[PDB]
């Protein structure tokens, strides 16, 4: 009863709900963001979730396992494999910075453990004065530069914690999971859920001289009529839905290749998606934003969110723990939990690449894991040391990449494979039938909507995207394009090796 409940609640908590979402909403004028977000959830998130479960199960029934191959099975065209490459590129690229963020959560957990945490400036009552110590904790941790300097200078502790995080991730990927998987996740997910609920409830009673936590909830759920005409918000919102639902990643597809063709995917898929939404908009969205506005004020919360991706909670949360009962211990627990939550997700975003190396190109587990780990570890130095690089990757892979790729999966699965064949595939084994209207949404509304969104988005933000020289971001654009070309090269090598016999 209670156990089954807390167990059901723990399945969806990702860093996407806590660290990422607050930053996405704040950078976009919260609530002006919520409308497109909710609309995207109903018109894009749910249908694609169902689509991914169907495609994954279908591909498992066959045995491809990766999007390049499943796409090839659905559409026999060399071009299908290339569009399919996004199913490896997106998760790999997200893994590159995602592992670093996880390392920040471990570092913070450690610092809270030792009681080395930021306390507000006594008797200062100045929102900027109040914000500087908390800003400094994160900034001193990752080593933010003064004056938009290209080079970032992370503290030694952060780097060592990164090394440890990689060692732990690799150590896990090589050997299976027995002592730290079910036995620990079954404790941490319910614990984290309970803790998060505690925090939402606690933060909402918070009211201070610089603002009120209530004002934060009002700020987040009050539509800004003005920002709706902004493509960036629509793209950001859809991108977040994709990220938070794990939807846009080839990981859900591969994981889904393990459930039987006759097993229901309609109720199960809808349940996972709905549970995920209730899991963030209510808990993650109701903690960090209200806390920052109550504490730092609106202007500072937005400025902090706009500072970079994931920054917001690393500041707002520690600020919150202060002035709270057993806040240092509560903080340690929160960040350690968060750390495990991140880990669970990173091995999952590495699984598409590992699986690709094993099924195609016929590589062992050791080699797939070691080469994948080598790529994330080496590449991550770009995100830890190059200013604005992390943000750029989080943008291209976790925001833009996923929506375009989502559209690709919808066209490939529904249009090319079969309107009705696709519907039939989704429908088999369902506990309930798919609502009649979604056939029409998926076939006409969702794809037209997304295509239009990307087009309107481009040429609004493209020229602005060509107008940005930080000297450190062009390295990242060139580099990630190179990585994409490299993966295309791996798919080419797989077909050459097969055709050679």
């Amino acid at each position: 009863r209670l156990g089954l409940i807390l167990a059901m609640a723990g399945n969806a908590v990702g860093l996407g709900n806590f660290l990422r979402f607050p930053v996405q909403a704040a950078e976009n004028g919260g609530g002006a963001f919520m409308i497109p977000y909710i609309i995207a959830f109903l018109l894009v998130g749910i249908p694609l979730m169902w689509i991914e479960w169907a495609m994954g199960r279908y591909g498992g029934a066959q045995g491809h396992g990766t999007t390049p191959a499943i796409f090839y099975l659905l559409w026999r065209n060399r071009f299908a494999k290339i569009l399919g490459v996004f199913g490896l590129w997106i998760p790999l690229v997200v893994a590159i910075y995602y592992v670093y963020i996880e390392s920040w959560t471990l570092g913070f957990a450690i610092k809270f453990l030792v009681g080395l945490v930021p306390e507000p400036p006594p008797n200062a009552t100045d929102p900027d004065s109040i914000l500087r110590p908390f800003k400094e904790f994160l900034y001193s941790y990752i080593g933010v530069p003064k004056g938009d300097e290209p080079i970032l200078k992370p503290s030694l502790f952060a780097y060592i914690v990164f090394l440890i995080t990689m060692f732990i991730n690799v150590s896990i990927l090589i050997r299976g999971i027995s002592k730290g998987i079910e036995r620990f996740a079954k404790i941490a997910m319910p614990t984290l859920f309970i803790l998060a609920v505690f925090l939402v409830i606690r933060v909402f009673l918070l009211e201070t001289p610089n603002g009120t936590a209530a004002d934060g909830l009002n700020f987040l759920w009050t539509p800004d009529f003005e920002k709706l005409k902004d493509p960036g918000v629509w793209i950001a919102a859809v991108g977040q839905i994709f990220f938070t639902l794990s939807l846009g990643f080839g990981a859900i597809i591969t994981y889904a290749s393990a459930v039987r063709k006759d097993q229901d995917i309609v109720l199960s898929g809808l349940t996972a998606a709905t549970l995920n939404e209730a899991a963030e908009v209510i808990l993650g969205g109701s903690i960090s934003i209200p806390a920052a506005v109550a504490f730092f004020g609106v202007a500072n919360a937005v400025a902090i969110a706009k500072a970079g991706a994931f920054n917001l909670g690393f500041i707002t949360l520690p600020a919150i723990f202060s002035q709270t009962a057993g806040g240092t211990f509560l903080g340690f627990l929160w960040f350690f939990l968060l750390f495990f939550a991140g880990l669970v997700a990173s091995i999952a975003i590495m699984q598409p690449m590992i699986a690709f190396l094993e099924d195609e190109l016929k590589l062992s587990r050791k080699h797939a894991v070691l080469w994948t780990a080598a790529i994330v570890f080496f590449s991550a130095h770009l995100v830890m040391f190059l200013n604005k690089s992390l943000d750029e990757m989080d943008f291209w892979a976790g925001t833009i990449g996923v929506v375009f790729f989502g559209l690709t999966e919808l066209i490939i699965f529904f249009w090319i494979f079969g309107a009705d064949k696709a519907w039939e595939e989704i429908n088999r084994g369902g506990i309930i039938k798919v609502p009649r209207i979604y056939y029409y949404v998926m076939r006409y509304i969702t794809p037209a909507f997304l295509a239009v969104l990307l087009v309107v988005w481009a040429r609004e933000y493209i020229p602005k995207i060509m107008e940005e020289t930080h000297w450190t971001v062009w390295i990242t654009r060139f580099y990630i394009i190179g990585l994409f070309l490299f993966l295309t090269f791996l798919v080419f090598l797989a077909e050459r090796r097969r055709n050679h016999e």
């Epitope: 498992g60 066959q62 045995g63 299976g176 393990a258 459930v259 039987r260 006759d262 699986a355 099924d359």
Partner: antibody, heavy 118, light 112 residues
């Protein structure tokens, strides 16, 4: 580069129980269904039943329903088949084979021999 | 269940000539216009060995000598030209309906 390695030959008194371990190497174990099949030396292959390594969740063919229990150790990347209520007719060669994600049965085990006699 | 009946149980053929083994099914093996019958080469002392999948498709590592054919119920495994090491029992399988079922096997022997 995938290898499936099976315990070996075993002798048992009729009515007893045995547990055969098919150990999986060189691939991500959770990604792929593992199938269990029975073959007499002079007979065609009967499918015993499969198991989904990620979620467990075995399915046995009607014929073998009570005589075969399929389990898995995810830590050691191993699949297990336990045969109970042994009889001479249970004496045969047993194969574990994983099709990719479950085409079927692309990679085969070396096989395991069971002799039921006193 | 779906029962697979294989034509000649024992087949003997001279070197360089073609061998045609057949497979018949009680129900259609086709779902979504795809034939789910699969062929296996098993030598004594060995496990089976996958030859052809989805009935028309040549598995890797297997020489082009092995070709799949047929549809609906009837299926045809064609080995031309037959080679010496191709002596073994050959099986067919149907994955379309669960559970899965196998043919009784066809033992090939060369005429020397």
């Amino acid at each position: 580069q995938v290898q499936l390695q099976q315990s070996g030959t075993e002798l048992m008194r009729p009515g007893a129980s045995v547990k055969i371990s098919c150990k999986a190497f060189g691939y991500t174990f959770t990604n792929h269904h593992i199938n269990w099949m029975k073959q007499r030396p002079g007979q065609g292959l009967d499918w015993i039943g499969y198991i989904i390594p990620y979620n467990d969740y075995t399915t046995n063919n009607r014929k073998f329903k009570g005589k075969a229990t399929l389990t898995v150790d995810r830590s050691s990347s191993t699949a297990y088949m336990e045969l109970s209520s042994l009889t001479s007719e249970d004496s045969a060669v047993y194969y574990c084979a994983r099709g990719n994600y479950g085409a079927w049965f692309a990679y085969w085990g070396q096989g395991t021999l069971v002799t039921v006699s006193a | 269940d779906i029962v697979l009946t294989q034509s000649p149980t024992y087949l003997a053929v001279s070197l360089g000539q073609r061998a045609t083994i057949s497979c018949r099914a009680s129900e259609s093996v086709d779902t979504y216009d795809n034939s789910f019958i699969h062929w296996y080469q098993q030598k004594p002392g060995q496990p089976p060995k996958l030859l052809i999948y989805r009935a028309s498709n040549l598995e890797s590592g297997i020489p082009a000598r092995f070709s799949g054919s047929g549809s609906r119920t009837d299926f045809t495994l064609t080995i031309n030209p037959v080679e010496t090491d191709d002596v073994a029992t050959y099986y067919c399988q149907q994955s379309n309906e669960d559970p899965l079922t196998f043919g009784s096997g066809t033992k090939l022997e060369i005429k020397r």
